[PDB]
Short mmCIF file of C-alpha atoms and ligand atoms in Angstrom, two decimals:
data_model
loop_
_atom_site.label_atom_id
_atom_site.label_comp_id
_atom_site.label_asym_id
_atom_site.label_seq_id
_atom_site.Cartn_x
_atom_site.Cartn_y
_atom_site.Cartn_z
CA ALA A 1 15.99 6.00 14.93
CA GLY A 2 13.39 7.78 12.81
CA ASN A 3 11.08 10.77 12.71
CA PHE A 4 7.76 11.84 14.18
CA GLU A 5 5.94 13.62 11.34
CA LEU A 6 3.06 16.10 11.62
CA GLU A 7 1.35 17.62 8.58
CA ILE A 8 -1.18 20.42 8.84
CA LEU A 9 -4.13 19.77 6.54
CA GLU A 10 -6.50 22.67 7.19
CA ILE A 11 -7.23 25.55 9.53
CA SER A 12 -10.60 27.30 9.69
CA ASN A 13 -10.44 30.71 11.42
CA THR A 14 -13.20 32.43 9.46
CA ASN A 15 -13.30 35.68 11.46
CA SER A 16 -9.49 36.14 11.67
CA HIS A 17 -9.54 36.31 15.47
CA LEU A 18 -7.05 35.28 18.13
CA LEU A 19 -7.87 32.86 20.93
CA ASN A 20 -8.24 35.80 23.36
CA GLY A 21 -11.02 37.18 21.12
CA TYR A 22 -9.07 40.09 19.65
CA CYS A 23 -8.21 40.49 15.96
CA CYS A 24 -5.18 39.17 14.16
CA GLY A 25 -2.74 41.61 12.62
CA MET A 26 -2.69 45.29 13.43
CA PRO A 27 -5.49 46.68 15.62
CA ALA A 28 -7.99 48.31 13.29
CA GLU A 29 -7.79 51.60 15.21
CA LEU A 30 -4.08 51.92 14.34
CA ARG A 31 -4.66 51.09 10.66
CA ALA A 32 -4.59 53.84 8.04
CA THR A 33 -6.70 51.86 5.55
CA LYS A 34 -10.31 51.51 4.41
CA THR A 35 -10.31 47.88 5.57
CA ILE A 36 -13.39 46.81 7.54
CA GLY A 37 -13.09 44.23 10.30
CA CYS A 38 -10.13 42.24 11.56
CA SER A 39 -6.91 42.07 9.59
CA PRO A 40 -5.95 38.58 8.40
CA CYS A 41 -3.91 36.22 10.51
CA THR A 42 -0.39 35.22 9.37
CA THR A 43 -0.64 31.64 10.57
CA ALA A 44 2.26 29.37 11.47
CA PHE A 45 2.20 26.27 13.68
CA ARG A 46 4.35 25.21 16.65
CA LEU A 47 4.67 21.53 17.58
CA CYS A 48 5.78 20.47 21.08
CA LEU A 49 6.42 16.73 21.41
CA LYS A 50 7.04 15.08 24.77
CA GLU A 51 6.55 11.89 26.76
CA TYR A 52 3.02 10.67 27.46
CA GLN A 53 1.43 12.93 30.09
CA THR A 54 -1.11 11.86 32.72
CA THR A 55 -2.32 15.30 33.91
CA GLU A 56 -3.57 18.67 32.67
CA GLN A 57 -0.31 20.46 33.49
CA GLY A 58 1.54 18.11 31.14
CA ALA A 59 -0.48 19.47 28.20
CA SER A 60 1.37 22.81 28.46
CA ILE A 61 4.55 23.77 26.63
CA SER A 62 5.92 24.88 30.02
CA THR A 63 6.87 21.31 31.02
CA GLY A 64 9.27 21.27 28.06
CA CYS A 65 9.38 19.42 24.75
CA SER A 66 11.75 16.51 25.34
CA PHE A 67 11.02 14.78 22.03
CA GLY A 68 11.57 17.98 20.05
CA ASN A 69 9.94 21.26 19.09
CA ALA A 70 9.57 23.06 15.78
CA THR A 71 7.67 25.91 14.15
CA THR A 72 6.52 25.85 10.54
CA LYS A 73 6.91 28.65 8.07
CA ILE A 74 3.87 30.86 7.55
CA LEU A 75 1.51 28.46 5.77
CA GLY A 76 -1.27 30.88 4.85
CA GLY A 77 -3.77 33.42 6.09
CA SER A 78 -6.68 33.03 8.49
CA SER A 79 -8.19 29.93 6.82
CA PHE A 80 -6.68 27.58 4.28
CA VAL A 81 -6.65 23.98 3.09
CA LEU A 82 -3.17 22.77 2.18
CA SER A 83 -3.27 20.98 -1.17
CA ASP A 84 0.25 19.59 -0.55
CA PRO A 85 0.65 19.09 3.22
CA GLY A 86 4.15 17.66 2.79
CA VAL A 87 5.84 20.94 1.88
CA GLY A 88 5.34 22.45 5.35
CA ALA A 89 5.45 19.22 7.33
CA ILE A 90 7.06 19.22 10.78
CA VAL A 91 9.65 16.42 11.05
CA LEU A 92 11.06 15.77 14.53
CA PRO A 93 13.93 13.24 14.61
CA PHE A 94 14.26 10.67 17.38
CA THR A 95 17.30 8.54 18.22
CA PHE A 96 17.49 5.05 19.79
CA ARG A 97 14.10 3.29 20.24
CA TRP A 98 10.76 4.89 19.40
CA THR A 99 8.74 5.37 22.60
CA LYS A 100 5.35 4.60 20.99
CA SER A 101 3.59 6.59 23.76
CA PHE A 102 3.71 10.38 23.48
CA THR A 103 1.95 13.69 24.07
CA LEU A 104 1.92 16.53 21.55
CA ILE A 105 0.86 20.16 21.85
CA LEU A 106 0.04 21.95 18.58
CA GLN A 107 -0.38 25.73 18.51
CA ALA A 108 -1.55 28.02 15.72
CA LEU A 109 0.26 31.35 15.96
CA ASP A 110 -0.31 34.76 14.40
CA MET A 111 3.10 35.82 13.08
CA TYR A 112 2.42 39.57 13.28
CA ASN A 113 5.58 40.91 14.94
CA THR A 114 5.69 44.36 16.57
CA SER A 115 7.48 43.94 19.89
CA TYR A 116 8.45 40.44 18.63
CA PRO A 117 7.35 37.41 20.68
CA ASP A 118 4.23 37.35 22.82
CA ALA A 119 1.70 34.72 23.88
CA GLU A 120 -1.32 36.90 22.99
CA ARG A 121 -0.81 35.86 19.35
CA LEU A 122 -2.03 32.31 20.02
CA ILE A 123 -4.78 31.57 17.51
CA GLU A 124 -5.65 28.07 18.74
CA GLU A 125 -4.18 25.21 20.72
CA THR A 126 -4.75 21.48 20.88
CA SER A 127 -3.15 18.44 22.45
CA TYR A 128 -3.23 14.71 21.78
CA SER A 129 -1.80 11.88 23.89
CA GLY A 130 -1.67 8.37 22.50
CA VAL A 131 0.39 5.43 21.34
CA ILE A 132 1.55 5.14 17.73
CA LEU A 133 3.68 2.50 16.01
CA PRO A 134 5.99 3.00 13.01
CA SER A 135 3.97 3.02 9.81
CA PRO A 136 3.58 5.16 6.66
CA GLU A 137 -0.15 5.34 7.43
CA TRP A 138 -1.26 8.69 8.83
CA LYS A 139 -3.46 9.20 11.87
CA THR A 140 -5.81 12.09 11.09
CA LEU A 141 -6.74 14.31 14.04
CA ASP A 142 -9.33 17.07 14.10
CA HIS A 143 -9.65 19.80 16.74
CA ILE A 144 -12.81 21.93 16.74
CA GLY A 145 -11.69 24.66 19.12
CA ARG A 146 -13.42 27.76 20.44
CA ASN A 147 -11.69 29.96 17.84
CA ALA A 148 -10.32 27.80 15.01
CA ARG A 149 -10.68 24.29 13.65
CA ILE A 150 -7.36 22.56 12.95
CA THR A 151 -7.20 19.30 10.99
CA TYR A 152 -3.78 17.64 11.00
CA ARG A 153 -2.17 14.22 10.77
CA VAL A 154 0.71 12.40 12.41
CA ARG A 155 2.85 9.34 11.82
CA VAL A 156 6.14 7.79 12.87
CA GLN A 157 8.60 6.30 10.37
CA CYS A 158 11.89 4.52 10.98
CA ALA A 159 15.05 5.85 9.40
CA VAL A 160 16.03 4.09 6.19
CA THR A 161 17.38 0.54 6.72
CA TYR A 162 15.68 0.29 10.15
CA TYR A 163 12.60 -1.73 11.06
CA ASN A 164 10.68 -3.22 14.05
CA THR A 165 8.37 -1.36 16.45
CA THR A 166 11.51 0.15 17.98
CA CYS A 167 13.01 1.34 14.69
CA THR A 168 16.31 -0.25 15.79
CA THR A 169 16.43 -3.47 13.71
CA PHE A 170 18.87 -3.01 10.82
CA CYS A 171 18.39 -4.65 7.45
CA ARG A 172 19.64 -3.84 3.96
CA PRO A 173 18.63 -6.23 1.14
CA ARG A 174 21.43 -7.93 -0.79
CA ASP A 175 21.79 -9.93 -4.02
CA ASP A 176 25.47 -10.70 -4.60
CA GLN A 177 28.18 -13.15 -3.55
CA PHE A 178 27.94 -12.14 0.13
CA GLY A 179 24.18 -12.65 0.49
CA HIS A 180 20.82 -13.11 -1.26
CA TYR A 181 17.98 -11.80 0.87
CA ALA A 182 15.15 -9.31 1.15
CA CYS A 183 14.13 -7.50 4.34
CA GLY A 184 10.99 -8.54 6.19
CA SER A 185 8.49 -6.22 7.80
CA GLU A 186 10.48 -6.16 11.05
CA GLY A 187 13.92 -6.31 9.44
CA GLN A 188 14.28 -10.08 9.16
CA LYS A 189 16.60 -11.43 6.49
CA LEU A 190 14.28 -13.23 4.06
CA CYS A 191 16.47 -15.55 2.01
CA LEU A 192 15.76 -15.48 -1.71
CA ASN A 193 14.55 -18.79 -3.09
CA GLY A 194 17.30 -21.39 -2.98
CA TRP A 195 19.50 -19.75 -0.34
CA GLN A 196 20.16 -20.33 3.35
CA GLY A 197 22.62 -19.38 6.08
CA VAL A 198 23.18 -16.43 8.39
CA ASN A 199 23.55 -14.04 5.44
CA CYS A 200 21.66 -16.26 2.96
CA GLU A 201 25.03 -16.82 1.27
CA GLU A 202 24.78 -20.63 0.97
CA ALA A 203 23.17 -22.12 -2.13
CA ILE A 204 20.73 -24.97 -1.50
CA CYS A 205 22.03 -27.79 -3.69
CA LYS A 206 20.07 -30.30 -5.79
CA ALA A 207 17.86 -32.75 -3.92
CA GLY A 208 19.96 -35.79 -3.08
CA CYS A 209 23.28 -34.02 -3.58
CA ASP A 210 25.78 -35.68 -1.24
CA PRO A 211 26.26 -33.27 1.71
CA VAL A 212 29.96 -34.15 2.09
CA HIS A 213 31.23 -34.78 -1.45
CA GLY A 214 28.88 -32.44 -3.30
CA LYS A 215 28.84 -28.64 -3.43
CA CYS A 216 27.06 -25.85 -5.27
CA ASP A 217 27.67 -22.16 -5.97
CA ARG A 218 24.18 -21.66 -7.48
CA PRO A 219 20.91 -23.12 -6.18
CA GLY A 220 19.75 -26.48 -7.47
CA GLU A 221 23.16 -27.60 -8.75
CA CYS A 222 25.51 -30.36 -7.60
CA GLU A 223 29.25 -30.03 -8.32
CA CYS A 224 31.51 -32.83 -7.13
CA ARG A 225 34.56 -32.55 -4.92
CA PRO A 226 37.72 -34.23 -6.25
CA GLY A 227 37.38 -37.96 -6.79
CA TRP A 228 33.57 -38.09 -6.71
CA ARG A 229 31.06 -38.22 -9.54
CA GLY A 230 27.46 -38.87 -10.53
CA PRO A 231 24.52 -36.46 -10.68
CA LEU A 232 24.52 -36.40 -6.87
CA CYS A 233 28.30 -36.66 -6.32
CA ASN A 234 27.82 -39.78 -4.18
CA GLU A 235 29.99 -42.17 -6.26
CA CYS A 236 33.72 -42.37 -5.54
CA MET A 237 36.23 -42.85 -8.35
CA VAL A 238 38.41 -45.95 -8.08
CA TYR A 239 42.16 -45.54 -8.52
CA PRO A 240 43.09 -45.90 -12.21
CA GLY A 241 44.09 -49.49 -12.87
CA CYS A 242 42.04 -51.04 -10.07
CA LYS A 243 40.81 -54.50 -11.05
CA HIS A 244 38.93 -56.60 -8.45
CA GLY A 245 38.38 -53.75 -6.03
CA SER A 246 36.37 -50.65 -5.16
CA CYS A 247 37.02 -47.26 -3.58
CA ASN A 248 35.06 -48.07 -0.38
CA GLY A 249 33.75 -44.55 0.03
CA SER A 250 37.16 -42.87 -0.33
CA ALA A 251 38.30 -41.07 -3.47
CA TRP A 252 40.96 -42.78 -5.58
CA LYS A 253 41.29 -45.97 -3.53
CA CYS A 254 41.39 -49.63 -4.58
CA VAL A 255 40.10 -51.80 -1.71
CA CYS A 256 40.14 -55.42 -2.78
CA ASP A 257 37.24 -57.81 -3.10
CA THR A 258 37.50 -61.05 -1.15
CA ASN A 259 40.34 -63.32 -2.30
CA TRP A 260 42.14 -60.55 -4.21
CA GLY A 261 45.24 -58.63 -3.19
CA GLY A 262 47.75 -56.07 -4.37
CA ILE A 263 47.70 -52.30 -4.72
CA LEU A 264 45.50 -52.75 -7.80
CA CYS A 265 43.69 -55.88 -6.52
CA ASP A 266 44.82 -58.08 -9.43
CA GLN A 267 46.49 -60.91 -7.48
CA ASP A 268 44.28 -63.97 -7.04
CA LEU A 269 44.92 -65.10 -3.47
CA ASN A 270 43.15 -68.47 -3.88
C1 LIG B 1 10.67 -6.71 16.85
O1 LIG B 1 10.68 -6.19 18.21
C2 LIG B 1 10.46 -7.17 19.23
C3 LIG B 1 10.63 -6.45 20.56
O2 LIG B 1 11.85 -6.78 21.21
C4 LIG B 1 11.37 -8.40 19.13
O3 LIG B 1 10.78 -9.48 19.84
C5 LIG B 1 11.31 -9.81 21.15
O4 LIG B 1 12.73 -10.25 21.18
C6 LIG B 1 13.04 -11.61 20.83
C7 LIG B 1 14.30 -11.57 20.01
O5 LIG B 1 15.45 -11.93 20.78
C8 LIG B 1 11.87 -12.22 20.09
O6 LIG B 1 12.22 -13.52 19.64
C9 LIG B 1 10.68 -12.29 21.03
O7 LIG B 1 9.52 -12.72 20.33
C10 LIG B 1 10.40 -10.94 21.69
N1 LIG B 1 10.49 -11.05 23.14
C11 LIG B 1 9.78 -10.28 23.97
C12 LIG B 1 9.97 -10.54 25.44
O8 LIG B 1 9.02 -9.41 23.56
C13 LIG B 1 11.57 -8.90 17.70
O9 LIG B 1 12.65 -9.82 17.66
C14 LIG B 1 11.81 -7.74 16.74
N2 LIG B 1 11.97 -8.24 15.37
C15 LIG B 1 13.17 -8.40 14.82
C16 LIG B 1 13.17 -8.93 13.42
O10 LIG B 1 14.21 -8.11 15.40
CA1 CA B 2 -12.02 32.38 14.95
#
């Protein structure tokens, strides 16, 4: 999941015309003003996003906008450069996996409403088909049309906690008892130094720490299980009172040396 983002950067429509060659706003004949020339446009932008299209008919908004459609607020007059493109950005959410391939249709529209909608109010129209991967980097596009020049930019970003080219790999970094890991560029758990395991919840103990009789709750340490000792927890403790004997790799035992017997190995056998 994530969003396809489009930010208008500039439109240049110096003569305040429509694509059909007429003026924006009210026809000058119907105006009761001293204004000379065309009235200014009231420009907004409509984005139609859809699957990658292999023919000219696909570059129309008549084939539908499966990936979403939106219209900005009025962003300015006939020509303007947006100092802060983010405020009027078009954000189209997508669910499941990002498609990578797409076709967009971007229209500039004169929002002068008299009989309410009409297609004569198209100022300019452009289309772009391509393949884009999730990234905060913008792709800048520039359309020098017959009537207006539109500069805009697009990007795709995964929803928060999602990664990978598909925006479906989940990762949330953790630094507590249940895990110690950062998130990689594709959502991989990157264990913090000294940790391992499925959730990077296992401390990596001191080098040489006995894997069976040693443990650690913090990296680089070696704590001994009952009846074992030494810096590496590899030395068993003999049963208290054991004389001529050893633990033989088992905690609290007294296994006799040759020619000694008894529970404490203190009986000379010969
Ligand atoms: C990023 O997306 C790709 C696309 O699926 C993942 O790579 C594929 O899937 C397996 C995982 O089971 C990878 O080991 C292979 O290298 C890829 N196989 C094919 C046929 O493309 C990749 O795993 C994703 N990254 C993460 C962290 O999930
Ligand atoms: Ca023009």
